[PDB]
Write a protein that binds this ligand. Structure first.
Ligand SMILES: Nc1ncnc2c1ncn2[C@@H]1O[C@H](COP(=O)(O)OP(=O)(O)OP(=O)(O)O)[C@@H](O)[C@H]1O
Ligand SMILES: [Mg+2]
Lengths: 395, 831
């Protein structure tokens, strides 16, 4: 308390000093998207505003007299108009092709710069930019499943030289299936964390659109932007949202979703080669998927995430209780034996509920009795709401 | 008006009336009742008697009672009421006075808040008192000797610390430390030392050291003495302890710090202690870790570049640097440990210098096996290969003290070679091998090289860098004298060469962290011509105040940076910018404050001013990939000034050096794609990629260890060498002198947590690794880690990540769980 007066004096001085600094330097606005003044290259901004002319985005339609020295290019300037223009002197004639987006000036509309193809922003955001915080060490009891998944989705990208030499074409599709909570999306997150290529996460419900043909358009643009990369991975979580089998119910039952699924199938294995895209789909209802989607060349590997066995359940218990403040003699093998048919999610909940039982009793260490009560509460008491017994008929 | 409040208001008159009667028979009961009445409300912290606050003027009637006659019992309780009242207003020389002259009973009987105010006033008047008032502190010492145990009784140890700190009398604190509070008081005093200046720096340091020594806490006492760089105190601490295991742990700490001791053969367990302190077993321990952490497979630079995901002599040299950095201290590589002659000759001119020298990086700390691979390239006829292997010898021997000096033997016969390249390799290897040794034999062998006529300016600068690295922080007279002679012997036009910039640096390395020992050196430098004189003076001054946090020197450096010049005259501005980081790196608050100053320097500064800000950011955040610095450097990676771009990219590499950061790797790959057509920028990007995966993520370049409280002088010297050489990245790094990057070898340490048994065998133990939490202040047991995970002990600790034993089966010998730690079976466990 003896320093309190000086504490407040120096604190107020510091606040006044910070305000004074911000007075000379900057840090304001932030609602009109203004960068801090330390990054303001105003002279270069003026030089850009004068020298660098704006360019309207158009689409080239037809090249007339491409062979001769006066090729005319019909461009469709979006909602503006259609023009017959010529390339600028700084663009090679072979750099502009029919049907590609270009950027032209506003005076004579001469083509000034070829442009990347238009991609829906919703499709663009589907690519993963922050890798998940899950490694393959966080998935227990899935040794064979993880190995099979990695030798399809990771090994060909990491070491392609081992495959080209033997004339070997690795599988380009994996379907992870199993009851809910078995670790399909966990393994997908592990893949996305370990991968170095472009990873795109697509949820099936995201491919359902209001208008007719829009979902197929999103699928087409997804595979178009996936082909603009040397190697790419597309994850289709809950593919049963759009991957259902085709049927005719008199009315137009699921016709648009079937068209979206057909577009996805055509992209996977159709007349045109798919490319270096290696797709990955996870579903808890693989019985509903279309037979054409469940076919090799589209889903070559079918990895089953069945419920863990005794060793797998013990491994999952060790994984989830690693950072636990457990006692010294926790019989995790016994706990794994006490939940015969249980998913990894139930095991994680058992660990969490044992910790919660210990916390509720104001204890810093969870005993074996706490884990037994957690098993009773989660595996036994909550067994009414278990998704397991219904969903292993589907898998 | 409360009825009891009205009664106490009656006591303002009726009790004073009892004290107004001539006879003393009514004086004692009324005064004692008032003294107990003060305690009546003192029983509640918030409750204070508001009626006595109206008795403050009533002291006029009581003025004669406490002043005008005998002090037996009349003034005794009369003055104490005035003292309790004086807690309310300013109390300048009052609240102390009546407690001093009045009753001298137990202090806490008058309240915790009252005694807190009294202690604050004691410090305030102690500052006022002059020498002639030494006969005024007789009661003051008694008050402090009673206040300190009272503060420690009610867990108010930190408040006690301020009291002796203000009066500059912390010395008696060690007398009254109990076993329940030594850790807290020592922790608070050590946390305070980073901000108090000299001589209170050493005073606080020695006081906490004495407290630790009294309690036989030998490892932390040794840490504290190492913070004091008191070699005599290091020796005394090491030989005072009788526990062999504690001495082994302390030897591990000394070996990590780079401090070595010459023990006596009479000392028990001399052999193993010397081996621990010499880090001869560092290579085997590192390889055992890597085998446990299944990372022994070599990594080709292609796996780092990842060119298959991307939608020349310089290229080959950059790739050799990447191969050396990624596989550092692993002993295996698919590119040079195989038949590397094709690869090594794929490089051209001075590239062959670094590439062959890079072959020494994979064999770091492995002297016996490393020289066995150097020998093959030692006999190469090409001028560059032999000297590159010579420098690889010192790189291999760097960080490990061999009893029979191999590097000196292999490099002595080439420091006066006619070819300047064989020389260049030999001095640099010798400097790396014997960094932080102050070995008189090596220095005497090396020193005449600087004065040799055949020695070029490049050679002279390399010799200065080496001799500084051997004698870093030692204030060696011989090295200082010869460096001064070399500096003033050169012509003014000769000093225009940037290799002369290395001459002060070694001089600066000589007095690294010494402080105010440079005034003679500065006076000597005053006679040197300009603008080299300003450069040299700035360099040596900064190196002297390295890692001190002296805001005055930072103010001087900012004044140097203030006046900008419309290059040639402005060279020392970059040194000042680097010096802001070199001084502010000591403590976290200063570094985070200096980050804003670096931003302002980048914003308002001139090119030469802003060409060094990335180097300052790299120095202040090396191996610490915090996102703010990474984003700041990324904003200037594609800078208009090429030098700013090169420095920003290299600083991005150094900041995440050894961190294996995925985000930084993505940024570096994107920069490599962006800078594909710029050979210099692409080379810098490859260097950054190599640094980011240094030692496959198991090595750090941070100069601070022991919970970021101990500065490694050798690491600082290596980082300083590389960064100061980067002030002329166009001519030194991108030129023919890229071998100076191997100075980073001096700063390579493993981010380690290896738990050993009492017989030094590995001992896997469950531990919790998480971001360090400041535990100053808050009492009881506060958690020192947040967001932690449980791993087996052979785990790599990131920057700012502490580790605490998960269970209590083992007791650590030292509180700091970094590097090699010895664990002992806990007697309480399994009771
Ligand atoms: N094999 C496993 N090893 C470790 N933890 C597991 C395993 N399987 C599941 N878990 C845990 O249970 C959680 C279940 O979520 P997860 O995303 O894996 O389910 P899912 O199989 O995708 O389910 P759904 O079919 O409902 O989408 C995981 O987040 C993880 O914490
Ligand atoms: Mg899922």
């Amino acid at each position: 308390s003896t320093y309190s007066r000086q504490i407040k004096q120096v604190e107020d001085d510091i606040q006044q000093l910070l305000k004074k600094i911000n007075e000379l330097t900057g840090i304001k606005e932030s609602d009109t998207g203004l960068a801090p003044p330390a990054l303001w290259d105003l002279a270069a901004d003026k030089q850009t505003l004068q020298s660098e002319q704006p360019l309207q985005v158009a689409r080239c339609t037809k090249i007339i007299n491409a062979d001769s020295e006066d090729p005319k290019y019909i461009i469709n300037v979006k909602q503006f108009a259609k023009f017959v223009v010529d390339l600028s002197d700084q663009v090679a004639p072979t750099d502009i092709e029919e049907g590609m987006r270009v950027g032209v000036d506003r005076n004579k509309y001469q083509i000034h710069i070829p442009l990347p193809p238009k991609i829906d922003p919703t499709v663009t955001m589907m690519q993963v930019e922050e890798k998940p915080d899950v490694t393959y060490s966080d998935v227990g009891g899935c040794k064979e499943q993880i190995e099979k998944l990695r030798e399809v989705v990771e090994t060909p990208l990491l070491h392609p030289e081992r495959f080209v030499n033997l004339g070997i074409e690795p599988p380009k599709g994996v379907l992870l299936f199993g009851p809910p909570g078995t670790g399909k999306t966990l393994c997908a997150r592990a893949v996305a964390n370990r991968t170095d290529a472009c990873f795109i996460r697509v949820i099936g419900s995201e491919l359902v659109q209001k208008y007719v043909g829009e979902g197929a358009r999103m699928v087409r643009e997804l595979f178009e932007m996936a082909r603009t990369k040397k190697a790419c991975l597309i994850f289709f979580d809950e593919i049963d949202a759009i991957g259902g089998a085709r049927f005719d119910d008199g009315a137009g039952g699921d016709n648009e979703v079937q068209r979206t699924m057909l577009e996805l199938i055509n992209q996977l294995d159709g007349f045109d080669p798919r490319g270096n895209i290696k797709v990955l789909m996870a579903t808890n209802r693989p019985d509903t998927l279309d037979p054409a989607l469940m076919r090799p060349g589209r889903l070559d590997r079918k990895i089953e995430f069945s419920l863990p066995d005794l060793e797998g359940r013990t491994h999952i218990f060790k994984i989830h209780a690693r950072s636990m403040s457990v006692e010294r003699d926790i019989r995790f093998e016994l706990l794994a034996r006490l939940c015969p048919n249980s998913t990894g999610a139930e095991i994680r909940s058992v660990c969490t509920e044992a910790g919660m039982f210990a916390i509720r009793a104001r204890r810093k260490i969870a005993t074996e009795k706490d884990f037994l009560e957690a098993v009773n509460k989660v595996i036994k008491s909550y067994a009414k709401f278990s998704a397991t017994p219904r969903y292993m008929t589907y898998n | 008006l409360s009825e009891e409040d009205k009664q106490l208001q009656d006591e303002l008159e009726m009790l004073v009336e009892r004290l107004g009667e001539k006879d003393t028979s009514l004086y004692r009961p009324a005064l004692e009742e008032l003294r107990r009445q003060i305690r009546s409300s003192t029983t509640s912290m918030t409750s204070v008697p508001k009626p006595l606050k109206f008795l403050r003027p009533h002291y006029g009637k009581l003025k004669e009672i406490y002043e005008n006659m005998a002090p037996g019992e009349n003034k005794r309780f009369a003055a104490d009421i005035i003292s309790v009242l004086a807690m309310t207003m300013s109390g300048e020389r009052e609240c102390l006075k009546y407690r001093l002259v009045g009753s001298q009973e137990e202090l806490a009987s008058w309240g915790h808040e009252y005694v807190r105010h009294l202690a604050g006033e004691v410090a305030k008047e102690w500052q006022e008192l002059d020498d002639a008032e030494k006969v005024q502190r007789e009661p003051l010492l008694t008050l402090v000797k009673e206040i300190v145990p009272y503060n420690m009784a009610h867990n108010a140890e930190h408040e006690a610390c301020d009291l002796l700190m203000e009066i500059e009398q912390v010395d008696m604190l060690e007398k009254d430390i109990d076993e329940n509070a030594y850790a807290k008081v020592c922790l608070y005093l050590t946390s305070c030392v980073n901000y108090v200046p000299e001589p209170e720096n050493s005073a606080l340091l020695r006081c906490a050291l004495g407290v630790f020594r009294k309690f036989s806490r030998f490892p932390e006492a040794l840490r504290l003495a190492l913070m004091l760089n008191d070699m005599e105190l290091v020796e005394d601490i090491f030989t005072s302890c009788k526990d062999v295991v504690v001495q082994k742990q302390m030897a591990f700490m000394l070996g990590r710090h780079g401090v070595f001791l010459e023990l006596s053969e009479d000392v028990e367990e001399y052999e193993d202690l010397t081996e621990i302190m010499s880090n001869v077993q560092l290579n085997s321990n590192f390889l055992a870790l890597a085998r446990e952490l299944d990372i022994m497979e070599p990594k080709v630079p292609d796996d780092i570049y990842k060119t298959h995901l991307e939608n020349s002599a310089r290229m080959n040299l950059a790739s050799s640097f990447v191969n050396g950095f990624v596989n550092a201290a692993f002993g295996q590589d698919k590119l040079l440990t195989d038949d590397g002659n094709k690869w090594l000759y794929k490089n051209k001119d001075h590239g062959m210098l670094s590439a062959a020298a890079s072959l020494g990086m994979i064999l770091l700390w492995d002297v016996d096996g490393g020289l066995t691979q150097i020998d093959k390239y030692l006999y190469s006829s090409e001028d560059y290969i032999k000297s590159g292997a010579l420098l690889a010898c010192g790189i291999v021997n760097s960080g490990v003290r061999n009893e029979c000096d191999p590097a000196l033997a292999l490099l002595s016969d080439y420091v006066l070679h006619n070819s300047n390249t064989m020389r260049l390799g030999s001095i640099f290897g010798l400097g790396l091998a014997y960094a932080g040794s102050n070995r008189e034999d090596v220095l005497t062998l090396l020193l005449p090289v600087m004065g040799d006529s055949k020695s070029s300016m490049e050679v002279a600068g390399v010799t200065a860098l080496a001799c500084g690295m051997i004698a870093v922080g030692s204030c060696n007279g011989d090295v200082t004298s010869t460096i001064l002679q070399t500096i003033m012997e050169k012509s003014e036009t000769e000093l225009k060469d940037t290799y002369a910039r290395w001459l002060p640096l070694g001089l600066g390395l000589n007095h690294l962290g010494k402080g105010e020992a440079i005034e003679a050196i500065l006076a000597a430098l005053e006679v040197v011509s300009e603008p080299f004189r300003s450069f040299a003076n700035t360099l040596v001054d900064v190196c002297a105040y390295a890692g001190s946090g002296n805001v005055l020197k930072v103010q001087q450096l900012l004044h140097i940076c203030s006046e900008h010049f419309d290059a040639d005259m402005g060279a020392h501005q970059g040194v000042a910018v680097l010096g802001i980081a070199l001084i502010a790196m000591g403590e976290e608050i200063g570094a985070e404050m200096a980050l804003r100053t670096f931003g302002h320097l980048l914003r308002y500064g001139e090119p030469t001013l802003r060409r060094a800000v990335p180097l300052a950011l790299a120095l202040i955040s090396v191996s610490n990939p915090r996102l703010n610095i990474l984003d700041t450097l990324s904003k200037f990676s594609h800078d208009a000034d090429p030098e700013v771009s090169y420095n920003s990219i290299f600083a991005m590499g150094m900041v995440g050096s050894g961190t294996n950061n995925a985000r930084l790797a993505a940024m570096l790959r994107q920069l490599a794609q962006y800078h594909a057509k710029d050979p210099n920028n692409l080379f810098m990007v490859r260097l950054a990629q190599g640094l980011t995966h240094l030692g496959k993520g198991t090595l750090t370049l941070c100069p601070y260890h022991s919970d970021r409280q101990l500065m490694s002088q050798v690491a600082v010297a290596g980082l300083l060498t590389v960064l100061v050489s980067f002030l002329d990245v166009r001519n030194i790094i991108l030129g023919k002198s890229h071998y100076v990057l191997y100075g980073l070898v001096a700063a390579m340490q493993p981010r380690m947590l290896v738990t050993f048994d009492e017989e030094l065998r590995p001992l896997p133990v469950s531990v919790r690794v998480g971001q360090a939490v400041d535990v100053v202040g808050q009492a009881g047991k506060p958690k020192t880690i947040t967001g932690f995970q449980t791993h087996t002990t052979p785990v790599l600790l990131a920057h700012g990540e502490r580790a605490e034993l998960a269970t209590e089966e083992f007791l650590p010998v030292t509180p700091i769980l970094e590097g090699f730690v010895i664990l002992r079976k806990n007697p309480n466990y399994d009771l």
